[PDB]
């Protein structure tokens, strides 16, 4: 097989002295690296950026003919990574170069056999503070028809964390628009929770971290993501060869999905990053 899924609810990608590189969530699907060395034990696969080794064990083949592999296409706009059968995020502008409604497939969604992508949010230093301003965050929610959101009106407060701990102001928006559906998720709403951030604070078990209120779940959030990842050297979103993606979030596709609200969110607000 060419392609391959991921069985457990998480498995490891490994180098070829077996040293775990990075993690990736059930249902991704790998491509098998044919200038590699397979053997029955190991597969040399390539996801998100990766080139390593998963163990068979882990893996499903699949048939392309049948089954649901990532792609990319054009809709002479956009260009959208299909992440899952019914998902699609828009990640590039347009070029000339791509075919409208053409599927085109891509180990890292900027190599392509007939053009290459900037995705220059992926690879962003998170320390540059953002060109908006809280006044300009705040006109997002209703420029996007983001209604019932606990992060309306909270632009000062990011521009703060921004200010305070050197991380740009549009990534945390972003971040905490992805991981929390725009401060409207269950977690969002019990615990201020914006950005996915677990500990084992308030149980025995790992459960998403408490925030007193948004303020000090935006400020809190963004001291955790300087202190455990800007701080340790992961200072882009990237993907799972290299950035906050390698740790943060097993889905494999966790960078671009915030690069691509970012682009979003730029593009609504006149382009200034
Ligand atoms: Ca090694």
Redesign the pocket.
């Given at each position: 097989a060419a392609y391959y899924q991921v069985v457990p609810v998480t498995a490891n990608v490994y180098?070829?002295?077996?040293?775990k590189?990075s993690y990736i969530s059930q249902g991704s699907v790998v491509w098998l690296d044919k200038d590699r060395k397979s053997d029955d034990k190991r597969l040399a696969i390539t996801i998100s950026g990766l080139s390593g080794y998963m163990k068979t064990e882990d893996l499903q083949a699949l048939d392309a003919s049948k089954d649901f592999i990532p792609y990319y296409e054009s809709d002479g706009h956009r260009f959208y990574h299909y992440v899952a059968q019914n998902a699609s995020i828009p990640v590039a502008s347009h070029l000339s170069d791509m075919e409208v409604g053409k599927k085109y497939y891509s180990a890292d969604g900027l190599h392509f056999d007939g053009f290459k992508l900037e995705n220059p949010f992926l690879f962003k230093d998170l320390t540059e503070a953002t060109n908006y301003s809280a006044e300009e965050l705040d006109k997002v929610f209703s420029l996007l028809n983001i209604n019932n959101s606990l992060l309306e009106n909270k632009g000062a407060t990011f521009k703060e964390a921004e200010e305070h701990y050197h991380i740009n102001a549009l990534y945390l928006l972003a971040h905490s628009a992805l991981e929390s559906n725009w401060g409207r998720s269950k977690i969002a709403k019990d615990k201020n929770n914006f950005f996915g951030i677990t500990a084992y604070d308030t149980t025995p078990y790992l459960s998403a971290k408490t925030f007193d209120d948004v303020d000090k779940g935006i400020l809190g959030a963004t001291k955790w993501i300087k202190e455990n990842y800007i701080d340790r050297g992961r200072t882009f979103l990237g993907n799972k060869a290299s950035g906050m993606n390698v740790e943060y979030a097993s889905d494999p596709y966790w960078g671009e999905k915030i690069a691509s609200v970012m682009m979003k969110i730029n593009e609504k607000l006149g382009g200034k990053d």
């Open positions: 180098d070829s002295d077996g040293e590189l």
